[PDB]
Design a binder for these strands. Structure first.
Ligand SMILES: [K+]
Ligand SMILES: [K+]
Ligand SMILES: [K+]
Ligand SMILES: [K+]
Ligand SMILES: [K+]
Ligand SMILES: [K+]
Ligand SMILES: [K+]
Ligand SMILES: [K+]
Ligand SMILES: [K+]
Ligand SMILES: [K+]
Ligand SMILES: [K+]
Ligand SMILES: [K+]
Ligand SMILES: [K+]
Ligand SMILES: [Mg+2]
Ligand SMILES: [Mg+2]
Ligand SMILES: [Mg+2]
Ligand SMILES: [Mg+2]
Ligand SMILES: [Mg+2]
Ligand SMILES: [Mg+2]
Ligand SMILES: [Mg+2]
Ligand SMILES: [Mg+2]
Ligand SMILES: [Mg+2]
Ligand SMILES: [Mg+2]
Ligand SMILES: [Mg+2]
Ligand SMILES: [Mg+2]
Ligand SMILES: [Mg+2]
Ligand SMILES: [Mg+2]
Ligand SMILES: [Mg+2]
Ligand SMILES: [Mg+2]
Ligand SMILES: [Mg+2]
Ligand SMILES: [Mg+2]
Ligand SMILES: [Mg+2]
Ligand SMILES: [Mg+2]
Ligand SMILES: [Mg+2]
Ligand SMILES: [Mg+2]
Ligand SMILES: [Mg+2]
Ligand SMILES: [Mg+2]
Ligand SMILES: [Mg+2]
Ligand SMILES: [Mg+2]
Ligand SMILES: [Mg+2]
Ligand SMILES: [Mg+2]
Ligand SMILES: [Mg+2]
Ligand SMILES: [Mg+2]
Ligand SMILES: [Mg+2]
Ligand SMILES: [Mg+2]
Ligand SMILES: [Mg+2]
Ligand SMILES: [Mg+2]
Ligand SMILES: [Mg+2]
Ligand SMILES: [Mg+2]
Ligand SMILES: [Mg+2]
Ligand SMILES: [Mg+2]
Ligand SMILES: [Mg+2]
Ligand SMILES: [Mg+2]
Ligand SMILES: [Mg+2]
Ligand SMILES: [Mg+2]
Ligand SMILES: [Mg+2]
Ligand SMILES: [Mg+2]
Ligand SMILES: [Mg+2]
Ligand SMILES: [Mg+2]
Ligand SMILES: [Mg+2]
Ligand SMILES: [Mg+2]
Ligand SMILES: [Mg+2]
Ligand SMILES: [Mg+2]
Ligand SMILES: [Mg+2]
Ligand SMILES: [Mg+2]
Ligand SMILES: [Mg+2]
Lengths: 128, 124
RNA sequence: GACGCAUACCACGGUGGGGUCUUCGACUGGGGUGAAGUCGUAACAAGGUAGCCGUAGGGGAACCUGUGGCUGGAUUAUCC
RNA sequence: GUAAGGCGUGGGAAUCUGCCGAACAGUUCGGGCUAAAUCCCGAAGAAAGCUAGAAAGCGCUGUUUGAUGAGCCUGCGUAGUAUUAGGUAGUUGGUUAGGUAAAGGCUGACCAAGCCGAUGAUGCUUAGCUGGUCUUUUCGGACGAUCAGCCACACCGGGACUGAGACACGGCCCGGACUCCCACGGGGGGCAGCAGUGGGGAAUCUUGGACAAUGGGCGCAAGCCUGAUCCAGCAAUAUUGCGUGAGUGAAGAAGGGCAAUUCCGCUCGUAAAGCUCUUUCGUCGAGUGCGCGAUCAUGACAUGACUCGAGGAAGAAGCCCCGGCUAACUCCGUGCCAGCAGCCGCGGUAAAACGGGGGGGGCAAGUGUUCUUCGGAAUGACUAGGCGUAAAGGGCACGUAGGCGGUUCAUCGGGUUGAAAGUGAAAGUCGUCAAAAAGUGGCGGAAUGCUUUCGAAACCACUGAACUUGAGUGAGACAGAGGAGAGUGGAAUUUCGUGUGGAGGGGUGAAAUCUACGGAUCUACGAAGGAACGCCAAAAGCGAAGGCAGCUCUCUGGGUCUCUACCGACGCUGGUGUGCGAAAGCAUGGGGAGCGAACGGGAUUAGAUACCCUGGUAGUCCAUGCCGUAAACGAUGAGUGUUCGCCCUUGGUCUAUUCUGAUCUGGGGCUCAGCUAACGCGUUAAACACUCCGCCUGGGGAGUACGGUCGCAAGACCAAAA
RNA sequence: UCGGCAAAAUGACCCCGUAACUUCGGGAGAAGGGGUGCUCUCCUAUCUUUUGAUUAGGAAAGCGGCACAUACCAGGGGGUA
């Protein structure tokens, strides 16, 4: 589901730079909504709603004008819990702001939370 | 290229020809003079540059420049040859080293004189 | 343990082909460079016949000519 | 030498293991080598005895073990080259015997036809591998020399013997080349051990001392061996080392250089000399040495070091550079000469650039020059680049491998992830302290990895049940120069015929060739024939591209719209391959109006192998094959998702409210953004992102040479180097 | 010697192996090599009209000689105009 995740994150970025209030995402997945929950918690989007997640899912996102770039990795990238911080140093362009989203056995988490819980996994992407 | 293309077919290096192939990755090579002559420079320069045709110890034939003013070279004189081309003269890619073997140094030279084999003048 | 000049294997040596390189060669080509020599003036301007591509033929030499294509040419108040 | 029988890393089973540690049992009797035995043979059960000097101390044998090594196997990782595409025939497997300490085509026989290879076998070239070394904001590149681990080799080939262990550097046998003796019958040798010598080379050291230390062999020890090692010698080869003084000094001495010849005229220059102080390093003379390396004892180094004394700034500064890049300027000489030069460039009478004087700058016991590596070089771009006009989109597709690609629920535990254990040799890198003063060590960290065990379950993979948004079908409506076949139409050109008619026509800038009184051009009617289809008609339409235009019919490919229809991720891209592919050209047979390479003639011109005119062959057309290239161009690969609008237009559908809106579908124009070296692009992007393929890496040489494949040829494709 | 004229040589079958070039048919028996007799014993078959032993082919072990296509018969081959 890497392609549709990158499609949705790019749709958000593109309508963000048009100054829009909301976007519609389709197709969606549970990975997409977990990425959006992490983005909403860090304040990059206002709110999001999931419609019909078990038949034909679409997501409405509420925008605020706060995200510069959201990217999904299109390749497999493993990271260990002791490896997360140096990866995030090399992956965020500012090396200060933004978050790397990791799929872990404890769930989909931002990179600081995954360091705190001492759990590694697969990098989904990042936003800043 | 894509990452898959780089996996299949990597990146080659830039291709650049050797400057001094006849030295055979040695710093110097001994030689014997075959013909001592002069050659005129490429325009816009104009002179009579003293060169020597030298057969090297690895049986390579080169043209080497004789630096400084005046020399004692003849046919069948031993010269030690170092790299370094002369920009006036195409096909001359080497230099003769002054003060070693048969090519004498230049006494009376006073400045920059270790490039011309000249000793320090003793103070009296 | 011999031992047999008994069989097998097998180095060197002999011999015939392959695979892959290499020395030399009468002669005959090509390229690069140069002060100035000979012949012309092909291209750059519509460069004096717009130029170029593939292909074909023709010519001291640049080149010329057909054929399809291109504009990477200039000029030139649409008209049942 | 070796490109995987090696090496790095992790495992395994089918083996052996002298000396060393620890148990148990034995160690009996004959014979042989001139003499004997711990030598050799025989019998039991395997053996072997010595020592009352080593009498319960060694040694041997058999059986169980620990430890250490060795053999064997294996997963993963580890060059270039496709201008090398097939390789193998004990080869791949099976059975049965043999061989081995041990699995095994290890090999005899028999049986089967396998095995390896486009995820690159085989061929060719190069190369020992690793820890590591140099460089570098991480990555990489070059190297694999010292030192350590593994492997291979020992003059070149081939063998085995002895042995716990070798197919053995200073062992044996055989063959070969070279070489030294020979009394001439024949023998002998192998520095890639340490020194050393010739030779090659730009270039690389003493034919040293001691076993004092550490390590090793033999011996119960005493000891003996040890060119292992330790330590001296030679070499600025390297190293963040130390020294060549510290102060003072104006006759601002002499002398040198420059100068309207300015301020002691400016400067060398407080520089020197002189005067006072201190003597590191080196020099010279002595003295203790269980100072220390070594201890029970033993010291090569050691003519050292240490300590004390003598002495006198004494013995110790160069090399490059000064036009710009790049810190540092004047005089004289020279006169495109002599010369300089890393690059750009200097020199032709006032040269800061050449050479000398004077002064100055940078480094400094060094400093320049050459070679070589990395950096700067984002100049092969993973980090981190590109392909409209600069190098670079394949002519266009289809498809193999490969790469990439929707949703939910459930299961699982291969990847992933957490912890533990094992391993990751030492040295080196990093941290830290102590030591030391150009020198050492300890403890950590790192070693990003692999194996095993036990957790987790989100993601990837795999399994099962489902979904419909991407793809594909159906039904119903359509549009179209899409393709192939078979028919048919008229205009015009040329030729021919028949009336009427009589002087030219044609052609140029001007002419002429040509054609015409055998009657042309012109005019009416007719005939023949080939090719192309006016108007419609174009920023229209269709096709993957190349391309496709009169009309009718047959057969046929694709596309669009609508659906409360089906189906259920069946998708995208695509190396190697396959197909299609303007025009010209080729082959065979037809056809031939017009046009027209070649060619003939007429002109122009200095010439005119051209441009202009006049004839005109191949060709252009058809049928069937070949070729496979174009400025095959949007100079823009295919696909997917997203991004403010306005004006047109192709083909549908819906809603209409009488004239328009809406939504798909392609085709155009303009534009907000954004992008762009600039020009410009802009929902049909060159925007914001992504997947997959092709291609580029300064110019010329060159799309050339060579080779292979293909073609009847013409040639085409892949495509270098000096 | 004008010239390998003449002569000599090669010669059969089975098996291995076969180049340049090519009009893809060839070249080709290219070239170059090995074996060949007899006895015994197995194996196979001969589509054995005396099938519990006879012929043909192949393995394997032996035997004799200078010599096993023993006489007779029976290609010389290659390169290049
Ligand atoms: K010089
Ligand atoms: K042409
Ligand atoms: K090792
Ligand atoms: K050897
Ligand atoms: K010793
Ligand atoms: K030096
Ligand atoms: K002194
Ligand atoms: K496809
Ligand atoms: K179309
Ligand atoms: K279509
Ligand atoms: K249409
Ligand atoms: K525009
Ligand atoms: K789009
Ligand atoms: Mg022209
Ligand atoms: Mg011209
Ligand atoms: Mg032009
Ligand atoms: Mg290969
Ligand atoms: Mg080697
Ligand atoms: Mg290596
Ligand atoms: Mg030797
Ligand atoms: Mg032994
Ligand atoms: Mg043995
Ligand atoms: Mg030796
Ligand atoms: Mg030696
Ligand atoms: Mg020498
Ligand atoms: Mg010892
Ligand atoms: Mg002992
Ligand atoms: Mg020694
Ligand atoms: Mg130093
Ligand atoms: Mg001293
Ligand atoms: Mg002394
Ligand atoms: Mg002592
Ligand atoms: Mg000493
Ligand atoms: Mg300066
Ligand atoms: Mg002057
Ligand atoms: Mg300079
Ligand atoms: Mg000067
Ligand atoms: Mg780089
Ligand atoms: Mg860099
Ligand atoms: Mg990149
Ligand atoms: Mg670039
Ligand atoms: Mg591109
Ligand atoms: Mg294209
Ligand atoms: Mg192109
Ligand atoms: Mg699930
Ligand atoms: Mg798992
Ligand atoms: Mg270590
Ligand atoms: Mg250390
Ligand atoms: Mg340390
Ligand atoms: Mg044609
Ligand atoms: Mg014809
Ligand atoms: Mg003419
Ligand atoms: Mg003409
Ligand atoms: Mg004509
Ligand atoms: Mg092309
Ligand atoms: Mg075209
Ligand atoms: Mg419409
Ligand atoms: Mg549109
Ligand atoms: Mg661009
Ligand atoms: Mg493509
Ligand atoms: Mg070509
Ligand atoms: Mg060729
Ligand atoms: Mg004759
Ligand atoms: Mg004859
Ligand atoms: Mg005869
Ligand atoms: Mg028989």
């Amino acid at each position: 589901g890497r392609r549709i995740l990158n499609d949705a994150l790019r749709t958000i970025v593109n309508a963000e730079r048009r100054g829009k209030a909301s976007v519609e995402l389709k197709p969606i997945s549970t990975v997409m909504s977990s990425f959006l929950r992490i983005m909403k918690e860090k304040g990059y989007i206002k709110n999001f709603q999931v419609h019909d997640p078990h038949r034909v899912g679409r997501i409405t996102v509420d925008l605020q004008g706060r995200v510069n770039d959201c990217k999904a990795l299109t390749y497999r990238q493993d990271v260990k819990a002791k490896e997360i911080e140096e990866y995030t140093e090399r992956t965020l362009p500012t090396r200060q702001w933004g978050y790397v989203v990791v799929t872990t056995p404890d769930g989909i988490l931002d990179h600081e939370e995954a360091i705190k819980r001492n759990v590694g996994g697969q990098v989904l992407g990042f936003f800043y | 290229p894509t990452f898959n293309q780089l996996i299949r077919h990597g990146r080659e290096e830039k291709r650049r020809t050797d400057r001094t192939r006849a030295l055979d990755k040695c710093p110097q090579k001994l030689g014997a003079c075959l013909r001592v002559s002069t050659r005129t420079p490429k325009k816009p320069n104009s002179a009579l540059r003293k060169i020597a045709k030298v057969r090297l110890s690895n049986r390579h034939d080169i043209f080497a420049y004789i630096p400084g003013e005046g020399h004692n070279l003849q046919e069948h004189s031993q010269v030690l040859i170092r790299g370094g081309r002369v920009k006036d003269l195409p096909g001359v890619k080497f230099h003769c080293i002054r003060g070693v073997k048969d090519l004498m140094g230049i006494p009376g030279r006073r400045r920059g004189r270790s490039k011309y084999g000249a000793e320090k003048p003793k103070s009296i």
